[PDB]
Amino acid sequence: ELCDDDPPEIPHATFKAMAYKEGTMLNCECKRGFRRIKSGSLYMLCTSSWDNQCQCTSSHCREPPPWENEATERIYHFVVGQMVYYQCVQGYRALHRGPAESVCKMTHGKTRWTQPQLICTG
Amino acid sequence: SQFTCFYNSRAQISCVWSQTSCQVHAWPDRRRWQQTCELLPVSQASWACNLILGAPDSQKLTTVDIVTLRVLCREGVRWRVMAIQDFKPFENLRLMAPISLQVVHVETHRCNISWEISQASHYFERHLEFEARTLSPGHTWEEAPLLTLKQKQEWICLETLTPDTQYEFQVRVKPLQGEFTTWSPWSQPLAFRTKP
Amino acid sequence: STKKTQLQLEHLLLDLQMILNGINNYKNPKLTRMLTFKFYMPKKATELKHLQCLEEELKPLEEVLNLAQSLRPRDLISNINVIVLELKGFMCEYADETATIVEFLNRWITFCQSIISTLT
Amino acid sequence: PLPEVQCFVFNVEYMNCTWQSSSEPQPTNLTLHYWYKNSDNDKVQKCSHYLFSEEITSGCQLQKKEIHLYQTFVVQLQDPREPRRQATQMLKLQNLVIPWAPENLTLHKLSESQLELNWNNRFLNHCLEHLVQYRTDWDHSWTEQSVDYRHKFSLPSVDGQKRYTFRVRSRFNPLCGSAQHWSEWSHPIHW
Ligand SMILES: *[C@@H]1O[C@H](CO)[C@@H](O[C@@H]2O[C@H](CO)[C@@H](O)[C@H](O)[C@H]2NC(C)=O)[C@H](O)[C@H]1NC(C)=O
Ligand SMILES: *[C@@H]1O[C@H](CO)[C@@H](O[C@@H]2O[C@H](CO)[C@@H](O)[C@H](O)[C@H]2NC(C)=O)[C@H](O)[C@H]1NC(C)=O
Ligand SMILES: *[C@@H]1O[C@H](CO)[C@@H](O)[C@H](O)[C@H]1NC(C)=O
Ligand SMILES: *[C@@H]1O[C@H](CO)[C@@H](O)[C@H](O)[C@H]1NC(C)=O
Incomplete structure (x- = not known):
């Protein structure tokens, strides 16, 4: 329940998870001109539901509801067994050779993400 | 008549009361908790009590805390307040006796002994003092010179010892902080013998 | 008196230095994930009342702390809370720039050391 | 570069x-x-x-x-x-911050076999910690002892037959700063 690094970047593609395993953490990041509230939570922790709640002011779990103000990119911390779906961004053609997901596995104490077998071209 | 308590710097307040059921109740002025202990007889007119605030090495009080300490005795239906004290824990420190005494190195005329301090707050940093004493075969503990360590030092090298001789050794500690802080109890005597 | 304040500040200092030492070292493989969390920083911190800025970050501090699988956050944070409150006695302004815990802890250490050194 | x-x-x-x-x-x-x-x-x-x-x-x-x-x-x-x-x-x-070295090193008996090392530093004081090193004419190395703002050091068991050398250095840590570097060594003194 640790999971060291983050999923690989695939050129001209993004990734999302549909269902988040317990132990996943979502950061409480705010948009430009906004900061998380005083005494706010630094993250939300999946336990299943989320144990905290992110909030912003002017300066298995489901995908959490979009709170008032937010950074465009949601920062996650996943855990072993987390699967992550990849897809070529709108306007890009996908070439598949094997799975289009990355899964956090656990070796002899060292976590890793599997390599999504996907190439994206315009 | 008398109600005296000491904080061990971590998670223990030891209380003594001299004036059937009686208890000590502790009310921290700025924490969301309270504790009690059943007073039990020691001397003819002495009762003693330990207030267990948390686990042995946990830091349950601070230098800004004030604990209201009450002695209560049954009296029929309710309780009667027998004594009161506004107890500033860091003004009334008394540590556990040092432990884990051992010989680091014995010669014929020398010995290095080390110890550990028990449940001593990290708040004290190095602001501690020690006193030690040696029991030699000719003499009593009472006759033994006090060895002053005006620093945090967790060993002593005893010099000018006599070969092939049985000694015992003892040590105690005191925080520099606090108006009513007292020496800890002496440690359990460590028996050792110089080389032939 | 000054000596009471100086002692309170040292104790706060030690509590903070305890956290810093406990997290900022090898044998804490949580460190780099802990480094990604944004702490908020005092615009000014030159006097006791500026400790309001510290107080308001104790909650997120405990959360970052709770991520260590080794230190004892609940007591530790409750202790820093009560000392801070005694010391501080306002409306806290924060810097635009956010910090890691390390930068956050070192700022607060600097603050304490800054007052302690004048106190005698 | x-x-x-x-x-x-x-x-x-x-x-x-x-x-x-x-x-x-x-x-x-x-x-x-x-x-x-x-x-x-x-x-x-x-x-x-x-x-x-x-x-x-x-x-x-x-x-x-x-x-x-x-x-x-x-x-x-x-x-x-x-x-x-x-x-x-x-x-x-x-x-x-680097302190000037400890000064006015004196030794003083509180018993025929207990001595106390004392010293002075120029300006800072509550802002300084110390390292005491000592050895006898019989030792192959220095015995060292960390010392807080009491710029004193107790030696509770000393041998009159041996000759002691003491030296002290100072450091601006941990109360007023977190300096890693020590002052230079004092002049050594002997008993
Ligand atoms: C007596 O034994 C102690 C403990 O083994 C020695 O103290 C240690 O010495 C080393 C090297 O000088 C230090 O790095 C440690 O910090 C010391 N430990 C403690 C707890 O102080 C001590 O030097 C010995 N005494 C003599 C005179 O030989
Ligand atoms: C700080 O810098 C000064 C100036 O560079 C150093 O003073 C010099 O000392 C050495 C020793 O003889 C020589 O280069 C000169 O005598 C000094 N420079 C002069 C007079 O211009 C000094 O060593 C440095 N450190 C300290 C501790 O002050
Ligand atoms: C460095 O500066 C000095 C004094 O201003 C000057 O005399 C010297 O020639 C300079 N060296 C250079 C620029 O090579
Ligand atoms: C040096 O220290 C001794 C002992 O504390 C003191 O009596 C003496 O006045 C000091 N000498 C000076 C003036 O530096």
């Missing part, structure tokens, strides 16, 4: 910031600029007192009034011929 600047604050009386410049073709007078990041008076300051080695800039000396411990000190080394070759370091000056 610009030379590293090392800054030391000497007994909080002044500060030397130095660098060895000789590791570059063409003899170069690098310049130093500094500023106190994120506080009052945060303007960029020019050295104003250059140190030289072999007629080439090697350091800067800042006077007491230019020193603000507790305020983030930024130093910048600059290639005078090319603006883009600049290097900056953010420094905490209270971690870089």
